[PDB]
Design an enzyme around this catalytic site. Structure first.
Site, short mmCIF file in Angstrom:
data_model
loop_
_atom_site.label_atom_id
_atom_site.label_comp_id
_atom_site.label_asym_id
_atom_site.label_seq_id
_atom_site.Cartn_x
_atom_site.Cartn_y
_atom_site.Cartn_z
N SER A 154 -13.28 39.02 2.98
CA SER A 154 -13.85 37.94 3.96
C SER A 154 -12.94 36.48 3.57
CB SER A 154 -15.19 37.57 3.96
OG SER A 154 -15.74 37.36 5.30
N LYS A 162 -17.86 45.28 8.01
CA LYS A 162 -17.51 43.80 7.85
C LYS A 162 -18.68 42.91 8.00
CE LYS A 162 -15.16 40.50 7.08
NZ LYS A 162 -16.17 39.96 6.24
N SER A 163 -19.05 42.02 7.15
CA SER A 163 -20.31 41.66 6.82
C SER A 163 -20.08 40.05 7.49
CB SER A 163 -20.70 41.50 5.41
OG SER A 163 -19.58 40.91 4.54
N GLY A 164 -20.96 39.34 7.64
CA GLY A 164 -20.65 37.66 8.10
C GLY A 164 -21.97 36.97 7.58
N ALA A 165 -21.73 35.85 7.23
CA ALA A 165 -22.75 34.98 6.68
C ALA A 165 -22.60 33.36 7.20
CB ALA A 165 -22.79 35.02 5.19
N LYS A 223 -13.46 38.46 11.85
CA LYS A 223 -12.03 38.74 11.03
C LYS A 223 -11.61 40.21 11.56
CE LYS A 223 -13.10 35.25 7.66
NZ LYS A 223 -13.89 34.93 6.80
N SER A 269 -18.26 35.72 9.92
CA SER A 269 -17.00 36.34 9.33
C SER A 269 -16.77 37.78 10.10
CB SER A 269 -16.88 36.63 8.01
OG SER A 269 -16.66 35.54 7.34
N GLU A 283 -11.61 28.53 10.05
CA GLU A 283 -12.53 28.74 8.97
C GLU A 283 -12.26 27.38 8.24
OE1 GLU A 283 -14.93 30.25 8.17
OE2 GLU A 283 -14.74 32.55 8.68
B1 LIG Z 1 -17.65 35.08 6.36
O1 LIG Z 1 -19.01 34.49 7.30
O2 LIG Z 1 -18.33 35.77 5.47
C1 LIG Z 1 -17.26 33.68 5.69
N1 LIG Z 1 -18.18 32.69 5.01
C2 LIG Z 1 -19.27 32.70 4.23
O3 LIG Z 1 -19.29 34.01 3.74
C3 LIG Z 1 -20.19 31.93 3.83
C4 LIG Z 1 -20.83 30.83 4.64
C5 LIG Z 1 -20.25 30.72 6.23
O4 LIG Z 1 -21.52 30.25 4.03
N2 LIG Z 1 -21.71 30.75 2.59
C6 LIG Z 1 -20.77 31.81 2.81
C7 LIG Z 1 -20.64 32.75 1.45
C8 LIG Z 1 -21.66 33.39 0.75
CL1 LIG Z 1 -22.98 33.41 1.53
C9 LIG Z 1 -21.29 34.23 -0.18
C10 LIG Z 1 -20.02 34.39 -0.86
C11 LIG Z 1 -19.02 33.34 -0.15
C12 LIG Z 1 -19.22 32.54 0.97
#
Ligand SMILES: *[B]([O])([O])[C][N]C(=O)C1=C([C])ON=C1C1=C(Cl)[C]=[C][C]=[C]1
Length: 263
Positions: free
Chosen positions: A105, A209-212, A48, A45, A141
């Site tokens: 996000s 801005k965070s990403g996961a 973004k 993310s 996405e």
């Molecule tokens: B971005 O990377 O912030 C959007 N995606 C996510 O946050 C995400 C992913 C790719 O896999 N799980 C999540 C997620 C988490 Cl870890 C917490 C809350 C919502 C989505």
């Protein structure tokens, strides 16, 4: 500072994953500290913010208006879209979409904004056109790639991302108004509390801005500084990990605690 690198190296061992880190002086753009600065990591993310940079560039050129309203439907909704989910009836303006994509996000917000510029390929063209030949968005996405090093789709490097973020918040690429709006959206980020913000002292400024990633990757890009104003850019990325989210968050927070302590 050396002490911050200690925490970065601790994080690699604790997470059993590689960690990329870079901190730049906001004014000079010079690298103050770094670790694996040129290695690739999934942007997730964090892209973004760059997307809204592209949108603001269009606003500056008179090709887009922040107040323009975009209507969409259920078919456009994808997972992780807390804000857009609630505006199917009245739509959302471009500024509301950037606010949502950055501060919550919101995935569908990002996709709708991507559509306004022509897709992932045009965000990559925008980056390429400003001198960033490293950062690349190849997917929509919620399908960004995480399979490095074999697949470099949707990746960046700490150095490229930090350099590009700085070019979007300072200088002349975007107008003063646009530079200020971008950092203002980032300052209002609502979903990065367990990261750098958890270590931030009262009175400090942070726009981030965070990403996961689905596979456990985690990251954050930020402009922060004492006395209510930013003076450094920090970018932190971590590859896939089996470690829990709590653990990934804690490691990044630990790195921030050190950064702050030794500012
Ligand atoms: B971005 O990377 O912030 C959007 N995606 C996510 O946050 C995400 C992913 C790719 O896999 N799980 C999540 C997620 C988490 Cl870890 C917490 C809350 C919502 C989505």
């Amino acid at each position: 500072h050396p002490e911050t690198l200690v925490k970065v190296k601790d994080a690699e061992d604790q997470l059993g994953a590689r960690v990329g880190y870079i901190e730049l002086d906001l004014n000079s753009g010079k690298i103050l500290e770094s670790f694996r600065p040129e290695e690739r990591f999934p942007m997730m993310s964090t892209f973004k913010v760059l997307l809204c940079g592209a949108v603001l560039s269009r606003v500056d050129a008179g090709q887009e208006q922040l107040g323009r309203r975009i209507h969409y439907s259920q078919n456009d909704l994808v997972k992780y879209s807390p804000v857009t989910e609630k505006h199917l009836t009245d739509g959302m303006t471009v500024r509301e979409l950037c606010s949502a994509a950055i501060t919550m996000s919101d995935n569908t917000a990002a996709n709708l904004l991507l559509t306004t510029i022509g897709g992932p390929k045009e965000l990559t063209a925008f980056l390429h056109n400003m001198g960033d030949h490293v950062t690349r968005l190849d997917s929509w996405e919620p399908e960004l790639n995480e399979a490095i090093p074999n697949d470099e789709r949707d990746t960046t490097t700490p150095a490229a991302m930090a350099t590009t973020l700085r070019k979007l918040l300072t200088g002349e690429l975007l107008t003063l108004a646009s530079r200020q709006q971008l950092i203002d959206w980032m300052e209002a980020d609502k979903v990065a509390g367990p990261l750098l913000r958890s270590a931030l002292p009262a009175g400090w400024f942070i726009a981030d801005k965070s990403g996961a990633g689905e596979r456990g990757s985690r990251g954050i890009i930020a402009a922060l500084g004492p006395d209510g104003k930013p003076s450094r850019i920090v970018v932190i990325y971590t590859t896939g990990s089996q470690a829990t989210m709590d653990e990934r968050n804690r490691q990044i927070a630990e790195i921030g605690a050190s950064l702050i302590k030794h500012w």
